[PDB]
Coordinates of C-alpha atoms and ligand atoms in Angstrom, one line a residue:
Chain K
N4 CA 130.9 -101.5 -133.5
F5 CA 134.2 -102.1 -131.7
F6 CA 134.9 -105.7 -132.2
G7 CA 135.1 -107.7 -135.4
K8 CA 135.5 -104.8 -137.9
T9 CA 136.9 -105.5 -141.3
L10 CA 140.3 -104.1 -142.1
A11 CA 139.7 -101.1 -144.3
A12 CA 140.9 -97.6 -145.2
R13 CA 139.3 -94.4 -145.9
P14 CA 141.0 -91.3 -147.3
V15 CA 140.5 -88.1 -145.3
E16 CA 139.6 -85.8 -148.2
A17 CA 140.6 -82.5 -146.4
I18 CA 144.1 -83.7 -145.8
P19 CA 146.0 -85.3 -148.7
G20 CA 147.8 -88.5 -147.9
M21 CA 145.9 -89.1 -144.6
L22 CA 144.2 -92.4 -144.2
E23 CA 141.8 -93.6 -141.4
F24 CA 141.7 -97.4 -140.8
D25 CA 139.2 -99.8 -139.3
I26 CA 141.2 -102.4 -137.3
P27 CA 139.8 -105.8 -136.5
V28 CA 139.7 -106.4 -132.7
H29 CA 139.0 -109.9 -131.5
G30 CA 137.5 -110.4 -128.1
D31 CA 137.3 -113.3 -125.7
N32 CA 137.4 -114.4 -122.0
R33 CA 140.8 -112.8 -121.3
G34 CA 140.2 -109.4 -123.0
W35 CA 141.1 -108.7 -126.6
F36 CA 143.7 -108.9 -129.4
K37 CA 144.5 -106.8 -132.4
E38 CA 147.0 -106.6 -135.2
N39 CA 147.6 -102.9 -134.7
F40 CA 149.9 -102.7 -137.7
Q41 CA 150.5 -105.3 -140.4
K42 CA 152.5 -104.0 -143.2
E43 CA 151.6 -106.8 -145.8
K44 CA 147.8 -106.3 -145.3
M45 CA 148.0 -102.5 -145.1
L46 CA 150.1 -101.6 -148.2
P47 CA 147.3 -102.7 -150.6
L48 CA 144.8 -100.5 -148.7
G49 CA 147.0 -97.5 -149.4
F50 CA 149.5 -97.5 -146.6
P51 CA 152.6 -96.0 -148.2
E52 CA 155.6 -98.2 -148.9
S53 CA 157.7 -95.0 -148.6
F54 CA 157.1 -95.2 -144.9
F55 CA 159.9 -97.8 -144.2
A56 CA 162.3 -97.0 -147.0
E57 CA 164.9 -95.1 -144.9
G58 CA 164.9 -98.1 -142.6
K59 CA 164.2 -96.0 -139.6
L60 CA 161.7 -97.1 -137.0
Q61 CA 160.5 -95.7 -133.6
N62 CA 157.5 -96.6 -131.5
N63 CA 156.4 -94.0 -128.9
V64 CA 153.7 -94.5 -126.2
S65 CA 152.0 -91.9 -124.0
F66 CA 149.7 -92.5 -121.2
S67 CA 147.3 -89.7 -120.4
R68 CA 144.3 -89.0 -118.1
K69 CA 140.9 -87.5 -118.7
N70 CA 141.0 -84.0 -120.4
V71 CA 144.6 -84.1 -121.2
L72 CA 145.2 -82.4 -124.5
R73 CA 148.4 -82.9 -126.5
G74 CA 149.1 -80.9 -129.7
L75 CA 149.3 -79.6 -132.3
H76 CA 152.5 -81.0 -133.5
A77 CA 153.7 -81.3 -137.1
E78 CA 157.3 -82.8 -136.9
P79 CA 159.1 -83.8 -140.2
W80 CA 158.2 -87.5 -140.1
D81 CA 155.2 -89.7 -140.8
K82 CA 153.1 -91.2 -138.0
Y83 CA 150.9 -94.2 -137.6
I84 CA 148.7 -93.6 -134.6
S85 CA 146.3 -95.8 -132.6
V86 CA 145.1 -96.5 -129.0
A87 CA 146.6 -99.4 -127.2
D88 CA 144.2 -99.9 -124.3
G89 CA 140.4 -99.5 -123.6
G90 CA 140.6 -95.7 -123.8
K91 CA 139.3 -93.2 -126.3
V92 CA 140.6 -89.8 -127.6
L93 CA 139.3 -87.1 -129.9
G94 CA 142.0 -87.1 -132.6
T95 CA 142.5 -83.6 -134.3
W96 CA 144.5 -82.7 -137.3
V97 CA 145.5 -79.4 -139.0
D98 CA 147.3 -79.5 -142.3
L99 CA 150.4 -77.1 -142.1
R100 CA 151.7 -77.8 -145.5
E101 CA 152.1 -75.0 -148.1
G102 CA 149.2 -74.8 -150.5
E103 CA 145.4 -74.9 -150.9
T104 CA 145.0 -77.3 -148.0
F105 CA 146.9 -75.2 -145.4
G106 CA 144.7 -75.0 -142.4
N107 CA 142.4 -77.8 -143.5
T108 CA 141.2 -79.9 -140.6
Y109 CA 139.8 -83.3 -139.6
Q110 CA 138.6 -84.7 -136.3
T111 CA 137.5 -88.2 -135.3
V112 CA 137.1 -90.4 -132.2
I113 CA 139.9 -93.0 -131.9
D114 CA 139.7 -96.1 -129.9
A115 CA 141.7 -99.4 -130.3
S116 CA 139.6 -100.3 -133.4
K117 CA 140.7 -97.3 -135.4
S118 CA 144.1 -96.0 -136.6
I119 CA 145.3 -93.0 -138.5
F120 CA 148.2 -92.5 -140.9
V121 CA 149.3 -88.9 -140.6
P122 CA 151.7 -87.6 -143.3
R123 CA 154.6 -85.5 -142.4
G124 CA 153.6 -81.8 -142.3
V125 CA 150.1 -82.4 -140.8
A126 CA 149.8 -81.3 -137.2
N127 CA 148.6 -84.1 -134.9
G128 CA 146.8 -83.7 -131.7
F129 CA 144.2 -85.3 -129.3
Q130 CA 142.3 -84.9 -126.2
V131 CA 141.4 -87.8 -123.9
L132 CA 137.7 -88.7 -123.5
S133 CA 138.1 -91.7 -121.2
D134 CA 139.4 -91.7 -117.7
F135 CA 142.9 -92.6 -119.1
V136 CA 144.3 -93.8 -122.5
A137 CA 147.4 -95.4 -123.9
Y138 CA 148.4 -93.8 -127.2
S139 CA 150.9 -95.7 -129.3
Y140 CA 152.3 -94.7 -132.6
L141 CA 155.0 -95.6 -135.1
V142 CA 157.3 -93.0 -136.8
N143 CA 160.0 -93.1 -139.5
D144 CA 162.5 -90.6 -138.2
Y145 CA 164.1 -89.7 -135.0
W146 CA 163.2 -86.8 -132.7
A147 CA 165.8 -84.8 -130.6
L148 CA 164.9 -82.1 -128.1
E149 CA 167.7 -79.9 -129.2
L150 CA 166.1 -80.0 -132.7
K151 CA 162.6 -79.2 -131.4
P152 CA 162.9 -75.5 -132.4
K153 CA 162.9 -76.7 -136.1
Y154 CA 159.6 -78.6 -136.1
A155 CA 156.3 -76.9 -136.8
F156 CA 153.6 -76.4 -134.1
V157 CA 150.3 -74.5 -133.8
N158 CA 148.6 -73.5 -130.6
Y159 CA 145.7 -75.8 -129.6
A160 CA 143.6 -72.8 -128.3
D161 CA 143.7 -70.6 -131.4
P162 CA 140.0 -69.9 -132.1
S163 CA 140.6 -69.4 -135.8
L164 CA 141.4 -73.2 -136.2
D165 CA 138.5 -75.2 -137.7
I166 CA 138.4 -77.6 -134.8
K167 CA 136.3 -78.2 -131.7
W168 CA 138.1 -79.8 -128.7
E169 CA 135.9 -81.8 -126.3
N170 CA 136.9 -79.6 -123.4
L171 CA 139.1 -76.6 -124.2
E172 CA 138.4 -74.6 -121.1
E173 CA 139.5 -77.5 -118.7
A174 CA 142.3 -79.0 -120.8
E175 CA 145.4 -80.3 -119.1
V176 CA 148.3 -79.2 -121.4
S177 CA 152.1 -78.9 -121.3
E178 CA 153.9 -75.6 -120.9
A179 CA 155.2 -76.2 -124.4
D180 CA 151.7 -76.6 -125.8
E181 CA 150.5 -73.4 -124.0
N182 CA 153.1 -71.4 -125.9
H183 CA 153.1 -72.7 -129.5
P184 CA 152.3 -69.9 -132.1
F185 CA 148.9 -69.2 -133.4
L186 CA 148.2 -70.2 -137.0
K187 CA 148.8 -66.6 -138.4
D188 CA 152.4 -67.0 -137.2
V189 CA 153.1 -70.4 -138.6
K190 CA 155.1 -70.6 -141.9
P191 CA 153.6 -73.3 -144.1
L192 CA 155.8 -76.3 -144.6
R193 CA 157.2 -76.9 -148.1
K194 CA 158.4 -80.4 -149.1
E195 CA 161.9 -78.9 -148.5
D196 CA 161.1 -78.6 -144.8
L197 CA 159.0 -81.8 -144.9
Chain H
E3 CA 158.9 -99.0 -107.3
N4 CA 161.5 -97.5 -109.7
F5 CA 159.5 -96.5 -112.9
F6 CA 160.6 -93.0 -114.1
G7 CA 163.8 -91.8 -115.5
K8 CA 165.7 -95.0 -116.1
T9 CA 168.7 -94.7 -118.4
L10 CA 168.3 -96.6 -121.6
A11 CA 170.1 -99.9 -121.0
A12 CA 170.1 -103.5 -122.1
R13 CA 171.2 -106.7 -120.3
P14 CA 171.5 -110.1 -121.8
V15 CA 169.8 -113.0 -120.0
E16 CA 172.6 -115.5 -119.6
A17 CA 170.4 -118.7 -119.5
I18 CA 168.6 -117.9 -122.8
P19 CA 171.0 -116.8 -125.5
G20 CA 169.8 -113.9 -127.6
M21 CA 167.4 -112.7 -125.0
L22 CA 167.7 -109.0 -123.9
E23 CA 166.0 -107.0 -121.2
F24 CA 165.8 -103.3 -121.7
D25 CA 165.3 -100.4 -119.2
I26 CA 163.1 -97.8 -121.0
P27 CA 163.2 -94.1 -120.0
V28 CA 159.8 -93.1 -119.1
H29 CA 159.2 -89.3 -118.7
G30 CA 156.4 -88.1 -116.4
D31 CA 154.6 -84.7 -116.2
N32 CA 151.3 -83.1 -115.4
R33 CA 149.6 -85.1 -118.2
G34 CA 150.8 -88.7 -117.4
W35 CA 153.9 -90.0 -119.2
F36 CA 155.8 -90.6 -122.4
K37 CA 158.3 -93.1 -123.6
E38 CA 160.2 -94.1 -126.7
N39 CA 159.2 -97.8 -126.4
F40 CA 161.4 -98.8 -129.3
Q41 CA 164.0 -96.6 -131.0
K42 CA 166.1 -98.4 -133.6
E43 CA 169.0 -95.9 -133.8
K44 CA 169.5 -95.8 -130.0
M45 CA 168.8 -99.5 -129.3
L46 CA 171.0 -101.2 -132.1
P47 CA 174.2 -100.1 -130.3
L48 CA 172.9 -101.6 -127.0
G49 CA 172.5 -105.1 -128.6
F50 CA 169.1 -105.0 -130.3
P51 CA 169.8 -107.3 -133.3
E52 CA 170.1 -105.8 -136.8
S53 CA 168.7 -109.1 -138.1
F54 CA 165.3 -108.3 -136.7
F55 CA 164.8 -105.8 -139.7
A56 CA 166.5 -107.6 -142.5
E57 CA 163.4 -108.9 -144.3
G58 CA 161.6 -105.6 -144.1
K59 CA 158.7 -107.2 -142.3
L60 CA 156.8 -105.7 -139.4
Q61 CA 153.7 -106.4 -137.4
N62 CA 152.6 -104.8 -134.2
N63 CA 150.1 -106.7 -132.0
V64 CA 148.4 -105.5 -128.9
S65 CA 146.5 -107.6 -126.4
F66 CA 144.4 -106.2 -123.6
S67 CA 144.0 -108.6 -120.6
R68 CA 142.4 -108.5 -117.2
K69 CA 143.8 -109.4 -113.7
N70 CA 144.9 -113.0 -113.3
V71 CA 144.9 -113.9 -117.1
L72 CA 147.8 -116.1 -117.8
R73 CA 148.8 -116.6 -121.4
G74 CA 151.6 -119.1 -122.6
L75 CA 153.9 -120.7 -123.1
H76 CA 154.3 -120.2 -126.9
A77 CA 157.5 -120.3 -129.0
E78 CA 156.7 -118.7 -132.3
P79 CA 158.6 -118.8 -135.6
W80 CA 159.6 -115.2 -135.5
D81 CA 161.5 -112.8 -133.1
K82 CA 159.5 -110.5 -130.7
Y83 CA 160.0 -107.3 -128.9
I84 CA 157.6 -107.1 -125.9
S85 CA 156.5 -104.3 -123.7
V86 CA 153.6 -102.8 -121.7
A87 CA 151.8 -99.8 -123.2
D88 CA 149.6 -98.7 -120.2
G89 CA 149.8 -98.4 -116.4
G90 CA 149.6 -102.2 -115.9
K91 CA 152.1 -104.9 -114.9
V92 CA 152.7 -108.5 -115.8
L93 CA 155.0 -111.4 -114.7
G94 CA 156.8 -112.3 -117.8
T95 CA 158.0 -116.0 -118.2
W96 CA 160.3 -117.6 -120.9
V97 CA 161.3 -121.2 -121.6
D98 CA 164.0 -121.9 -124.2
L99 CA 162.6 -124.6 -126.6
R100 CA 165.5 -124.5 -129.0
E101 CA 167.6 -127.7 -129.5
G102 CA 170.9 -127.5 -127.7
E103 CA 172.5 -126.9 -124.2
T104 CA 169.9 -124.4 -123.1
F105 CA 166.8 -126.4 -123.9
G106 CA 164.3 -125.9 -121.0
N107 CA 166.3 -123.0 -119.5
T108 CA 163.9 -120.3 -118.0
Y109 CA 163.8 -116.7 -116.9
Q110 CA 161.1 -114.5 -115.3
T111 CA 160.7 -110.9 -114.6
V112 CA 158.1 -108.2 -113.8
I113 CA 157.4 -106.0 -116.9
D114 CA 155.7 -102.7 -116.7
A115 CA 155.9 -99.7 -119.1
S116 CA 159.6 -99.0 -118.0
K117 CA 160.9 -102.5 -119.2
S118 CA 160.8 -104.3 -122.5
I119 CA 162.2 -107.7 -123.6
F120 CA 163.7 -109.0 -126.8
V121 CA 162.6 -112.7 -127.3
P122 CA 164.4 -114.7 -130.0
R123 CA 162.5 -117.1 -132.2
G124 CA 162.2 -120.5 -130.6
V125 CA 162.0 -119.1 -127.0
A126 CA 158.6 -119.7 -125.5
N127 CA 156.9 -116.6 -124.2
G128 CA 154.1 -116.0 -121.6
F129 CA 152.8 -113.8 -118.9
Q130 CA 150.4 -113.4 -116.0
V131 CA 148.6 -110.2 -115.4
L132 CA 149.3 -108.6 -111.9
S133 CA 147.4 -105.3 -112.3
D134 CA 143.6 -104.9 -112.8
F135 CA 144.2 -104.8 -116.6
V136 CA 147.2 -104.5 -118.9
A137 CA 148.0 -103.5 -122.5
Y138 CA 150.7 -105.7 -123.9
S139 CA 152.2 -104.4 -127.1
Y140 CA 154.8 -106.2 -129.2
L141 CA 156.7 -106.0 -132.4
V142 CA 157.4 -109.1 -134.6
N143 CA 159.3 -109.6 -137.8
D144 CA 157.1 -112.0 -139.8
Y145 CA 153.4 -112.1 -140.6
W146 CA 150.9 -114.3 -138.7
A147 CA 148.8 -116.7 -140.5
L148 CA 146.5 -119.5 -139.4
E149 CA 148.6 -121.9 -141.6
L150 CA 151.8 -121.1 -139.5
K151 CA 150.4 -122.6 -136.3
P152 CA 152.0 -126.0 -136.9
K153 CA 155.5 -124.3 -136.7
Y154 CA 155.1 -123.1 -133.2
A155 CA 156.2 -125.0 -130.2
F156 CA 154.2 -124.9 -126.9
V157 CA 154.9 -125.9 -123.4
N158 CA 152.4 -126.1 -120.5
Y159 CA 152.5 -123.2 -118.1
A160 CA 151.9 -125.6 -115.2
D161 CA 154.6 -128.2 -116.1
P162 CA 156.2 -128.8 -112.7
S163 CA 159.6 -129.5 -114.4
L164 CA 159.7 -125.9 -115.4
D165 CA 161.9 -123.9 -113.1
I166 CA 159.3 -121.0 -112.8
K167 CA 156.8 -119.7 -110.3
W168 CA 153.5 -118.0 -111.1
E169 CA 151.7 -115.6 -108.7
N170 CA 148.2 -117.0 -108.5
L171 CA 147.3 -120.4 -110.0
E172 CA 144.1 -120.9 -108.0
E173 CA 142.7 -117.8 -109.6
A174 CA 144.5 -117.9 -112.9
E175 CA 142.4 -117.5 -116.0
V176 CA 143.8 -119.9 -118.7
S177 CA 142.5 -120.6 -122.2
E178 CA 141.6 -124.2 -123.2
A179 CA 144.5 -124.2 -125.7
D180 CA 146.9 -123.1 -122.9
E181 CA 145.6 -125.6 -120.4
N182 CA 146.3 -128.5 -122.7
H183 CA 149.8 -127.7 -124.2
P184 CA 152.3 -130.6 -123.7
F185 CA 154.8 -131.0 -120.9
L186 CA 158.4 -130.3 -121.6
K187 CA 159.3 -134.0 -121.8
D188 CA 157.0 -134.3 -124.8
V189 CA 158.1 -131.2 -126.7
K190 CA 160.4 -131.9 -129.7
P191 CA 163.2 -129.3 -129.4
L192 CA 163.2 -126.7 -132.2
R193 CA 166.1 -127.1 -134.6
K194 CA 167.3 -123.8 -136.0
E195 CA 168.2 -125.5 -139.1
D196 CA 164.8 -126.0 -140.6
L197 CA 162.8 -123.8 -138.2
Ligands
DAU201 C1 158.3 -86.7 -129.0 C2 159.3 -87.2 -128.0 C3 159.3 -86.7 -126.7 N1 160.2 -87.2 -125.8 C4 160.2 -86.7 -124.4 C5 160.4 -85.3 -124.1 C6 159.5 -85.0 -122.9 O1 160.2 -85.2 -121.7 C7 158.4 -86.1 -123.0 C8 157.1 -85.5 -123.7 O2 157.4 -84.8 -124.8 P1 156.3 -83.8 -125.5 O3 157.0 -83.2 -126.8 O4 155.7 -82.9 -124.4 O5 155.2 -84.9 -125.9 P2 153.7 -84.8 -126.4 O6 153.1 -83.4 -126.1 O7 152.9 -86.0 -125.9 O8 154.0 -84.9 -128.0 C9 154.5 -86.0 -128.6 O9 153.7 -87.2 -128.4 C10 152.4 -87.1 -128.9 C11 151.7 -88.3 -128.3 O10 151.7 -88.3 -126.9 C12 152.4 -87.1 -130.4 O11 151.0 -87.1 -130.7 C13 153.4 -85.9 -130.8 O12 153.7 -85.9 -132.2 C14 154.7 -85.9 -130.0 O13 155.5 -84.7 -130.2 O14 158.9 -87.1 -123.9 C15 161.1 -88.1 -126.2 O15 162.0 -88.7 -125.4 N2 161.1 -88.7 -127.4 C16 160.2 -88.2 -128.3 O16 160.3 -88.7 -129.5
DAU202 C1 149.0 -113.7 -132.8 C2 147.9 -113.3 -133.6 C3 146.6 -113.6 -133.3 N1 145.5 -113.3 -134.1 C4 144.2 -113.6 -133.6 C5 143.9 -115.1 -133.5 C6 142.9 -115.1 -132.4 O1 141.6 -114.8 -132.8 C7 143.3 -114.0 -131.5 C8 144.1 -114.5 -130.3 O2 145.0 -115.5 -130.6 P1 145.5 -116.5 -129.4 O3 146.8 -117.3 -130.0 O4 144.3 -117.2 -128.7 O5 146.0 -115.3 -128.4 P2 147.2 -115.5 -127.3 O6 147.0 -116.9 -126.5 O7 147.2 -114.1 -126.6 O8 148.5 -115.6 -128.2 C9 149.0 -114.5 -129.0 O9 148.9 -113.3 -128.3 C10 149.8 -113.2 -127.2 C11 149.7 -111.9 -126.5 O10 148.5 -111.8 -125.8 C12 151.3 -113.5 -127.6 O11 152.1 -113.5 -126.4 C13 151.4 -114.8 -128.4 O12 152.7 -114.9 -128.9 C14 150.4 -114.8 -129.5 O13 150.4 -116.2 -130.1 O14 144.1 -113.1 -132.3 C15 145.8 -112.5 -135.2 O15 144.8 -112.1 -136.0 N2 147.0 -112.2 -135.5 C16 148.0 -112.5 -134.8 O16 149.2 -112.1 -135.2

């Protein structure tokens, strides 16, 4: 149940537009190999062609140790997330879009044999379960620190959120993540905000 | 032992036309680190070729390899942007297999998470793992198929005519395919024209 999975997608019913993928990982002598993202194979499974249409592309990589927790971040771009090494995280999502699904959540364990498409407006987070993990993701717009005040965030430790972190009490978080607003102070995102 | 806080920069490799080496800004904090491994808008102006994206094709492959694995040398019928995604380190090795004045020209460099490389189509690519393990992530601009294997060119990592040095050959872990690739003398240079 890590190697040799069939490429396949499942909708995440709580969060419209989100897709969870099984990625084939091929193992041998040396280690392993995957096609982490393959546009031609993934469009027919539901990966949105609208992802690449502005022609923008950026690939970010974080490397985190045990109990690090990063989130929850809902910037105005789409994300394709996966793990790039032998590590594992608890992936956590909260929908911050205006409407009936505001505050809807989903959680799942992500290793290199799973990926997630996260629509713009859905807050993304994770906590590391392994000793360390390489988290790699593709995005279709460009971040700027000076612009950070305009993106949406919600505080990881708000107890009204319908999530359970692996280890909240011992989480290693950034100063920024300690200070994001609680859910009751987040304005839901309209298509106009993305 | 310079890893953090490099300014984003690119350098051509003179011996292999089209090749570019990038310094990638890696930001550390209490949690580990973060990088923008690839960023089109910032990297086009530094030399990352616009042609990479022209067909609208994209595939991202990741290999995970243990210490002493040596993979190569493979020249594929597509361009490649290579980097390391974890804490590991490789010795990267390239041999130009393109027909012309630079056929057989080589370059090597250590790659960790703070360096990436643009490898043009027709340039053979390989690496040897220096750390205990490594996550090797790359971007390519055409889609892999079993039926495309006859379009690759290969050269043997051990060919003594190659102006290259590996770290540990005694202990190198090489695939049967890679052990048996032809020597440079027996490689037919790749014509751009048809390939
Ligand atoms: C998002 C981003 C960040 N940075 C820089 C700013 C900081 O010095 C360093 C870390 O930024 P932070 O905003 O604390 O990163 P982090 O909490 O990991 O959050 C980012 O990365 C997460 C993955 O690690 C994603 O799941 C989030 O969407 C994204 O915002 O990287 C960039 O240079 N470029 C970026 O695109
Ligand atoms: C390149 C590629 C490979 N595969 C499958 C075929 C094999 O079952 C497995 C590994 O293929 P091999 O050719 O033995 O792996 P390897 O010697 O590492 O070579 C590939 O992976 C290397 C990175 O490890 C690249 O540097 C090479 O350019 C690439 O050809 O992955 C795919 O399904 N898709 C691919 O795109």
